[PDB]
Symmetry: D2
Subunit: 489 residues, 4 copies
């Protein structure tokens, strides 16, 4: 039996674009993503699945049912996000005393007049519907973490198609400092209007995936899909700043804690002779972002600076984890090997014989322990495992995946890491971005035809860990690798 | 949601040889089976796995734990059997007024003196330990069906090795009418001593597998493994008679109902042009046995008789079901096709694309409905589904197998069949005869090393059906074929 | 035994970019492709394998060996192409009396002065080395078809990176009419200098793949990778014209026949209710291009015209064939289903149970017969099966693939189609564009490390068909589907 | 390129029961095997496939065709056997001066009168037909090894059914010394009548499989299928003696060499800590038989004797090899692991990742080198690799299997072993005993429906090695493990 502190909470994570739409009159066509996925050229090139969000789970209308099932499993923490385009679907007045040609955004003026002025533009319905939803959530008794940004930018801030075509004379999302300015004002307004329901705050969700897949990994089908290393750094630089600003904006209206949710991977060395490759990958992929928003360390050009306007802008770290990444040195370089981690064949086995999910990701619970202890030992900020799950509609690997990973959180905790919760990537099946509805990550299966939810056996396993605050003795065998034998290779 | 009558009960089945041994001092080396499996020649020929029962689950010593877990799932019916060799491990006095050379056993004298005399020979410990066990079971609140015979005969009644070598001058199990005589006396004695704990009675378990695999299907590794069509009929004839006699013996001491548990398969025609092949297979394999012990119809030679000493000797029918059998006509014949039913490759897919278990049996829930309605419409005796399960250690197919089959019982019931219970083949993993411990059929996994039990996710699914007396709405999707895609082919 | 006419010839096809480089001093860095594949951004996005052509087979230096092995198999026809960038690696003088802003290119002036002037710019070495190569080929006794264009454009005519970034102020390949003008002059110059060695002429290789994958199917990794339906039509329009012009240019200097090599697929209807979908797909994908360069029919805007400068510009049709495409209607639309044809999982089985190659293409010999008879019945131009093969390094499916397809050519011939040769896609392993060296299509395996060639068993099977001018009786069983059973699913 | 001596010959092996029948009027129902396989009980128990030899290849009538195809591949050695039951289908007069109760057969009187007397009983037709066949073979120019015994005993010497039932009062094959006596007389008669056509002599084929599978490994379905360790030793003892006697009988009439063909396996240790297990397995399985017929060493009881009537009765050793056997120590014991060697799953992969054939045997060329060098270093008798092949109808693994094994012969030769030929197990598909026609081991595929032969690509590979006396450079890559990737697991 593996016990967790009385204060450790078990729950789920969810996003607006992925789960909200589905119920009639729940559509939101005002985001760069809704557009990106309906684009005829994007569909013909096969960049997007062809699946439309409009036919999702239905969390905008069926949220009671979602929370009912969440209560039954005995979950005590939820992390949702507000959709920016629902509040402000129309352009806001250009914010005076703001020079777009200014590279840095060392500050933003947020005061009650400002908020009061933003209220004139905000969409009262969207605002009221959300309040109802977070209200219902709070009544059930769940701790609530609120995420400000989970990918989609409103169209007036980013037309993904124009940028894809190479046209930079339009709303260009994270490439423009305008977006940075408005994000900070948005953060504060929302904090300002929901602080009575929120418990902890998250500025954005996996900012690194937005900058990375949108401008470098163009085959993933993420917007704007314009390949450029340079522009990728521009967006990342703007994202870091948009965080510091949002952090300060929320503080201006609240004392609640504020952190960020980041996409992680455990970098494992292909050979003992690959230790340095690991260190280099973690820098390039993890440390540079957090040293920026924590130690305030960053570098324009190659000029390592230290902007005190960035220094100390994080309260907690959200840890997202799915699988590992195997790297190998290259004189000075390092590389990411295929046949391991995220680059595996679907429903088969990795080059190491570990099974792989419906998305082609390799089973590797051990990597969570590595990620949690590295963050803990380097920054000592408490953390939540804000995402962890597996695409597996049949539910063959999920029971083992769930118990094995919850086991590693427990293991990190005993090594001294302050981890306060485990939030499974998803309660129910949702829309997987470029992949569509085909990748099912939920503890509950969704009949997209009737919007009805079903309990997959692993939901009943989760109810035992949650309802017990521990990996009980009777399910302790699931803390193992799913038998590859009966599964495909 | 599929509801079952308030009186329908959910539980499990188990056998003595398969689950009892394991706890120190629980050994029983006095059966033809314990011997058959320790034989050096049998092991070298690969007829038996090499796995020894002595290292089983431990139900002789850990039965409280088994019943505890059984209570937690909300099971309300159990069907165990007493081991003949535990009561009478030593020979009994030849029963006077009994001519071995007599083909038929139209009767056996059982009266209180007789029983009282048998008590002089019975093993008081074995007798007391069993009483304790069935007591503990009964306290928990479970209905109890008791099976008199579940394969092993005591050595003094059958030396399997001598017969395997072709030596018929020794104790020869079902080939000798002596065995028939003693079985009837054994039945009555046990009924006589346990009638206060028993609820319903079963004479024997799958008598057809004993006669069939022991003398025709010699590759299965069942004793005595002497190939002969003729001797196979001799044993079957003696088994039918041993039932009628046991039935009468139990009646002599009790009013409780008495039925038999039989191994079934749903005979499906390979082509529409194969209907007659099905009818012929059901006769040859099902109807001839039950017409015998019910309508009293049988045939010595080819001489269709009607022994009133057999007529009407059944109260209820136990239905065991695992998979199907595909047959095809042959001018006058019919055949059993491979690549379907029981003759499939392990963890692969049948010739029809249906997944197969760790034993190579094909998924076919529909066959249960066929078996239940055919028995019901032909004999109208109420029934229990006394066995149904799947060898599946990983637990990939079990959730679907369980819910899909329970669904067909519900379906048979609504067609008018009086079915009063569903007993899953096994609570925990046990010893699978010639196959050893390798074929895991339990809702609970057993660490044979520590005798510790674990809940497989399907146990938690069963607890929902049992605890609810219905296939609740949230698990109603399991009533489907496991996705073959992620599984091996 | 299946016999072919005495005049039917058996051989192979090969391309310059794919097979030439490999031998020291054989590099050609002056093409849009050599650049596209060395681009650091393209590699990081995973658009190109990371494999470089510089390390190919070595046909520039080891061509004797290639022809030796070709003789041994008894092949009598070869179809190679000249690399444009090898002749004219430097820009040519803008051709006066030519207005780039002119949409149509109804003509090009080619006369002996012109040719004589081009000779001043041509790379004498490249020119001499090629002559040596085609000489050696011709001595062995092989009929020689010569292809003018097999994808790469010289850098001075197309910078793929600039266009990928959305910059259209540079050399833009098929988007500029300049390219059309120069292609026609190039065709004539080459015809003019090699007509003594050539037997038949081909203007370009699969023009439809260039226009299609380069501007619509952007995930394939073909240059320039700029997604635009409109630009795709522009390039296709320019390609059709560049053909007519090249056709006329070659005629100006030679009487030899001139055709085009096109990429094909057999459109099969998913259901009987899908016949119209097939017809629509063949139009959209086959007929519109050939009606253009044959009946002279085309349409600017939606304005169906008939440019007599295009009318009748084809002598023969090269048929390339690999697999099928399954389509399904959509009210007015039609769609391409995945799990069939080219969109199958690698080394597995299609949705129809047909095996798939190392590239994920489905086995479907029957489609060749369909393609050959449809072209024959619609245009009655004789044809060659200029490409047909399979990525299969192990050589498991090749023997069956080869014999089954050669069998369908024979079948088309007997239905009355004038087909004069079968050219297997490749003698040896070569560079598969965006896929790298990993997709091995050769009858001969190449150790890229030593440039050494090896005979795969299917080479010895081909030597029997070629050396015999027929599918001999002893290998006639290969005319079947490879057994899926032993292969992966 | 791997060259073989000019005197090394390449050919095939074949057996009478397996290949002869098929052509009308070629039936031979007078063997224990023909009976064993038609037995209704044996078929119902699934001990025999249900496939009947009567429908085999047809080598009794189509032998010209077989030799034609054999010539074309350039084979120069053949090893066939005469069917005992064809010569003497009726009982011979009990041979006077012969006491059945005599354990040892230290001698047999063979002289010209005897032979002349046997000629009175011999079947002239069978005798003439064989002569024609070996004549035709010899004309083509092939060296001919002749095997006296390749399993079937005539019915008058063995009724397998009676023994299976445990009845030892009848003709009991190798259990009776009568069989030993008659075998020696049979050997001499045949040598006496064919010595003009024969080149070298073999007494029997894999005697160890007859004794082993017939009396211990009873699941294989070999006659008589009576499980007994003791009787297994009796038959082995009688087989050794029947060899010495046959050896002497042949010498009495010929100077040609005489050896024996034995079934081999390379014993590999599971762990370095398993060396002794290997040594023990080779003794138990290889050395005890050859020390007997060579050093004359044997042991009745446990009494190690040295019968000079056995001493030195071997001229050459026939080496049969298919796969390996992995063993592991057991205090004093050793064991044969499953998932390796012969005990692997069909068309899958062994526990070591090596592919497996249609029979479930693991790819392990290296074992041939081990077997050849161990025999050479211990007895220094020259040898032939009389059998080596793979069940593989599709022909996926055969090309690699063939070249890899021929490569190891070459390797043994260079280590100093006198190996004079490689005879592939089979030219064409034949009847695989208990397995039926389903296991196809031929270089040529047989359409059992028309008796027509087809060349599998590996036949064309063999023609290159044979026709060249070497592994030419162009096919030298086949000396590797078939790629498991595209194959099933």
């Amino acid at each position: 039996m593996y016990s967790f502190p009385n204060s450790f909470r078990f729950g789920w994570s969810q996003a607006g674009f992925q789960s909200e739409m589905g119920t009639p009159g729940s559509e939101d066509p005002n985001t760069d993503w809704y557009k990106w996925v309906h684009d005829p050229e994007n569909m013909a090139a096969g960049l997007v699945s062809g699946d439309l969000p409009e036919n999702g789970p239905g969390y905008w209308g069926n949220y009671k049912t979602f929370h009912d099932n969440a209560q039954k499993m005995g979950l005590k923490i939820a992390r949702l996000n507000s959709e920016w385009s629902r509040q402000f679907p129309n352009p806001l007045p250009r914010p005076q005393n703001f020079d777009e040609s200014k590279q840095d955004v060392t500050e933003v003026e947020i005061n009650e007049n400002e908020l009061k002025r933003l209220d004139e533009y905000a969409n009262k319905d969207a605002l009221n519907h959300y309040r109802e939803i977070f209200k219902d959530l709070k009544s059930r008794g769940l701790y609530f973490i609120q995420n400000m940004y989970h990918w989609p930018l409103p169209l007036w801030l980013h037309d993904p198609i124009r940028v894809r075509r190479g046209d930079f004379t339009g709303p260009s999302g994270w490439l423009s400092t305008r977006t940075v300015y408005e994000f900070a004002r948005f953060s504060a307004y929302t904090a300002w209007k929901f602080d009575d329901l929120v418990d902890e705050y998250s500025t954005m969700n996996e900012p690194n995936v937005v900058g990375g897949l949108g401008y470098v990994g163009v085959k993933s089908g993420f917007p704007p899909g314009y390949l450029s290393f340079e522009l990728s750094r521009r967006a990342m630089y703007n994202i870091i700043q948009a965080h510091a600003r949002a952090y300060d904006g929320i503080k201006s209206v609240s004392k609640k804690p504020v952190g960020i949710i980041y996409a992680n991977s455990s970098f494992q060395p292909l050979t003992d002779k690959d230790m340095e490759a690991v260190e280099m990958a973690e820098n390039d992929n993890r440390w540079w972002f957090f040293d920026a928003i924590i130690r305030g360390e960053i570098t324009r050009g190659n000029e390592k600076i230290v902007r005190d306007d960035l220094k100390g802008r994080l309260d907690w770290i959200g840890v997202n984890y799915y699988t590992r990444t195997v790297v190998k040195r290259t004189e000075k370089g390092y590389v990411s090997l295929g046949g391991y981690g995220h680059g595996c064949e679907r429903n088969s086995v990795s080059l190491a014989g570990l099974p792989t999910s419906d998305f082609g990701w390799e089973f590797f619970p051990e990597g969570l322990y590595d990620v949690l202890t590295k963050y803990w030992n380097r920054y000592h900020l408490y953390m939540y495992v804000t995402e962890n799950g597996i695409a597996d509609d049949a539910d063959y690997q999920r029971p083992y995946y769930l118990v094995s990973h919850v086991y590693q959180v427990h293991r990190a905790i005993n090594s001294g890491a302050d981890v306060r919760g485990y939030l499974h990537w998803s309660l129910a099946d949702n829309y997987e971005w470029a992949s569509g509805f085909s990748m099912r990550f939920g503890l509950l299966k969704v009949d997209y035809n009737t919007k009805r939810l079903y309990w997959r056996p692993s939901a009943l396993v989760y109810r035992e860990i949650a309802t017990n605050g521990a990996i009980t003795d009777e399910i302790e065998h699931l803390n193992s690798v799913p038998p590859v034998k009966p599964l495909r290779h």
